[PDB]
Amino acid sequence: YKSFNRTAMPY
Amino acid sequence: YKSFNRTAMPY
Amino acid sequence: SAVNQENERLMEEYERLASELLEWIRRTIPWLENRTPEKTMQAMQKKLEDFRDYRRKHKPPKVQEKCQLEINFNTLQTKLRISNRPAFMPSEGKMVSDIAGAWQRLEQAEKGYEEWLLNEIRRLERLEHLAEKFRQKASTHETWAYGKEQILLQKDYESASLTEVRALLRKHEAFESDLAAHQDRVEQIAAIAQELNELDYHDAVNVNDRCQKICDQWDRLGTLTQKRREALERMEKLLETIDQLHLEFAKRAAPFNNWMEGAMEDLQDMFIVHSIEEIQSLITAHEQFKATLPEADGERQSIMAIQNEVEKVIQSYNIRISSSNPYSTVTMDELRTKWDKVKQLVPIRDQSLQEELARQHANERLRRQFAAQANAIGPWIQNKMEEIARSSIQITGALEDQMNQLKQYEHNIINYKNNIDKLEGDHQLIQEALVFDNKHTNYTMEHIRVGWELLLTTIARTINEVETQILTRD
Amino acid sequence: SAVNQENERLMEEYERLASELLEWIRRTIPWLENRTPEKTMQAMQKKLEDFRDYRRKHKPPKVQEKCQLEINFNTLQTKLRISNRPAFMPSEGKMVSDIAGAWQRLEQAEKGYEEWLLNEIRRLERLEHLAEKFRQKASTHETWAYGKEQILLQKDYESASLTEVRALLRKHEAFESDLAAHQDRVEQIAAIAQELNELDYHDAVNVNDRCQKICDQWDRLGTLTQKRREALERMEKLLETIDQLHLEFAKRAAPFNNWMEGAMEDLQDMFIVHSIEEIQSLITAHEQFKATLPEADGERQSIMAIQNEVEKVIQSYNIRISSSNPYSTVTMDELRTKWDKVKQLVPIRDQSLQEELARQHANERLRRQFAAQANAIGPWIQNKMEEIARSSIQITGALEDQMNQLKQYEHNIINYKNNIDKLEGDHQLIQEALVFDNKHTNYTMEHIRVGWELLLTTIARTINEVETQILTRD
């Protein structure tokens, strides 16, 4: 199963 | 006697 | 027959106990061969507990009850063998060979019931999360683009200045960066609608449409953003090339307007010259200016060819705005009517210069004819006085011989009277023309006047002196 | 006495002719000693013809009439000497010695009458031309500066933009060149008023004022032009430094607004992880972002310090205009309230991440306790089956010795029933928590289920088989 979960982009 | 008479300035 | 009644109550036990588990086995077989999935995940969560209660509560007794009936058979058939009694045959199909086949088909029905529910709730679990993540992502990006298309269509820049257009372009530049950050948002939503398509969501009918509507709008935004940039970059390059012409216009408009406004005073400037060289030097400088008229006319045409270029720009590119120069207060009408006034004054200055040249020539003509007579009358009188001075002393003692010469000189003077009157006229004419500077002669009318007045006073004097000397001698 | 009457009519001739020219000499002497100049030049032009008619018409007869009376005297006194008659003595003062003194004073009166009129009309001629050239020059430059002072005072630029101020400066640049061309105009008028002051114009009272008024205005124009340039160059450098801040503002406003708007989606983004490493990797990436919060907060403060600088510029230089950015659609309120929403979402994401970490830990806790029992029950049943398999074949021919071991194994199984029930609970809890992936054990509940179901089926089987073998042997 693929992962669609996203993480906030650090500055 | 002085001369006050003027002449047009050529371009 | 005491034991004969014991076997009747034990053989009906196997017949009743076989129907007890066969009515259970026939009621659970259609349930075990269900495999029809439910819509919600919670329904399959309960359906797994329904199978769990069967596996830990209703199958454990029936497993023991299967071999328990076999235990009773493999003892009852040994009892009817010791006391050799007729063998037992079960009614209809409640036999050992028959019950084994019911459990063989029941255990064949559940050969994947646990594995079907597990991988149905495994699939269902992903569908339930992806469904809410799709609704979350497609609404935050739906709302983002509300009005985005209509704002991209705005034709406000059609009447904007180079300041407002560059400022508009910097605002549009920022929206392009804002757009770029949402490429990975629609990329994600396209993949969520593909994973919800592969996993077969019950409402994938409306997701295929709700996702294609969002992806179709994105295609419109891509082109629309480059079409408005194409219009802003064109408007920026049209007003940029109009400003290059409005600055170059003002650059040469003021020097030319200053030259034109300055030449108008000099074309009318009054003057007064008393020398034939004094007037000549003015004509020398005026004819120098007359030579820089095609030189400045060529500049005038060049300056007008620059304001005719800005009217050509608005016309060719059809960007109807004010073709007025906001840098120079010098209009095209000013350059047409001011030039006409300067060309109109040149024959006026030529006419007034030549009329004064004619005056200076006439004044010098009078100076030349006065000097011709003065430098002839002056020396004639000085020689007539010296003749009388020599003739009035000693000579022949005879007074009558000196009286002949005295009355002869007298005639010479009478004949010369007209020649003196000539000078009085030409002298009157010189002062009537307002001239007093004669370089050709040394004598003025007064110097001739006194010479003639002396000449007549001293002829009558020496004549009367000879007349008294003739009488006082007898 | 015939000749005695002839002398009486000749001596009264000299007495009458002396009064004829003495009444003329006494009437022209006050006229000759006039030397009082006239105002117009035309009046002195006539006064020169008045002297000319005297010199060529009225003096020539009187010159001859002077020596003619002397001729008559130097003959009449020789007649009264031949016939010795009493000498003639003229009445009152009509004598020869007396008349010579009248002509000596008359010729002494005109010792510069022609030279006075000439150099009075010589001066007058220059005064008449300079008077009209002054009126010509002082009116063309009077009219030029009509309104020039009021236009220089205009304070229009107080509400103008950098575009309108630069354009205004280029218009003002052109007026400076227009001003420069008129320095030689006022220089000329100052010299014409000085030459009209030296030559003594009758109305030099009003020329000294009319010229000083024009020269005073010129002093005002010089300073006013540099004072308006000082205001335009200040307004240009204030709006220039405001634009440098509005471009630098928009430059960092969009990247930060895109980062902030992007981080709001990622702070709420839903997720589902089934591994303890799967959740850990999210916390790894979230705590990386938590580290770039003072890094971007410092950037946020820096960006606000740029829009607080433009409010400081308008306040310090008191040039009250709109401090709004015409380049960026990102307001200071947006940067305050959007940041507060991002800081508000961080504890939400920390709370929701840790609650899922607690879930993954609890799920792994259940996996570990299930595997501890499965990898002990599974091998216990496989070893209890092998004990029964070895105890059900051959051994001592005595069935009773194998019947002891079979009923012993039975007790061993009864005592183990509770330990199986433990696994059914922990299995229910694992699937209740939605876990199915146990890596620590190879056995599932079903593999233990069939082992136990086989274990009870095959204990009662081999027990009943030994019970039938004990009975069918007597």
From Swiss-Prot, chains A, B:
Residue range from the parent sequence: 218 to 228 of 299
Similarity section: Belongs to the myozenin family.
Subunit and interaction comment: Interacts with ACTN2, ACTN3, FLNA, FLNB, FLNC, LDB3, PPP3CA and TCAP. Interacts via its C-terminal region with MYOT.
Expression across tissues: Expressed primarily in skeletal muscle. Detected at lower levels in heart, prostate and pancreas.
Lineage: Eukaryota, Metazoa, Chordata, Craniata, Vertebrata
Functional summary from the UniProt entry: Myozenins may serve as intracellular binding proteins involved in linking Z-disk proteins such as alpha-actinin, gamma-filamin, TCAP/telethonin, LDB3/ZASP and localizing calcineurin signaling to the sarcomere. Plays an important role in the modulation of calcineurin signaling. May play a role in myofibrillogenesis.
Signal peptide: none
Protein name listed in UniProt: Myozenin-1
Compartment list: Nucleus; Cell projection, Pseudopodium
Swiss-Prot record, chains C, D:
Changes after translation: Ubiquitinated by FBXL22, leading to proteasomal degradation.
Gene Ontology MF terms in the entry: actin filament binding; calcium ion binding; channel activator activity; cytoskeletal protein binding; FATZ binding; identical protein binding; integrin binding; LIM domain binding
Tissue expr: Expressed in both skeletal and cardiac muscle.
Effect recorded for residue 234 to G: Found in patients with autosomal recessive myopathy and asymmetric muscle weakness without significant cardiac or respiratory involvement; likely pathogenic
Predominant subcellular localization, coarse grouping: cytoplasm
UniProt KW keywords: Actin-binding, Calcium, Cardiomyopathy, Cytoplasm, Disease variant, Metal-binding, Phosphoprotein, Repeat, Ubl conjugation
Places the protein is found: Cytoplasm, Myofibril, Sarcomere, Z line
Any one cellular-component term (Gene Ontology): Z disc
GO biological process: actin cytoskeleton organization; actin filament uncapping; cardiac muscle cell development; cell adhesion; focal adhesion assembly; microspike assembly; muscle cell development; negative regulation of potassium ion transport
Spectrin repeats mapped onto the chain: 9-119, 129-234, 244-355, 365-468
Disease: Cardiomyopathy, familial hypertrophic, 23, with or without left ventricular non-compaction: A hereditary heart disorder characterized by ventricular hypertrophy, which is usually asymmetric and often involves the interventricular septum. The symptoms include dyspnea, syncope, collapse, palpitations, and chest pain. They can be readily provoked by exercise. The disorder has inter- and intrafamilial variability ranging from benign to malignant forms with high risk of cardiac failure and sudden cardiac death.
Family, per entry: Belongs to the alpha-actinin family.
Subunit structure: Homodimer; antiparallel. Also forms heterodimers with ACTN3. Interacts with ADAM12, MYOZ1, MYOZ2 and MYOZ3. Interacts via its C-terminal region with the LDB3 PDZ domain. Interacts with XIRP2. Interacts with DST isoform 1 (via N-terminus). Interacts with PARVB. Interacts with SYNPO2.
Function recorded in the entry: F-actin cross-linking protein which is thought to anchor actin to a variety of intracellular structures. This is a bundling protein.
Protein name (Swiss-Prot/TrEMBL): Alpha-actinin-2
Native organism taxonomy: Eukaryota, Metazoa, Chordata, Craniata, Vertebrata
Name of the encoding gene: ACTN2
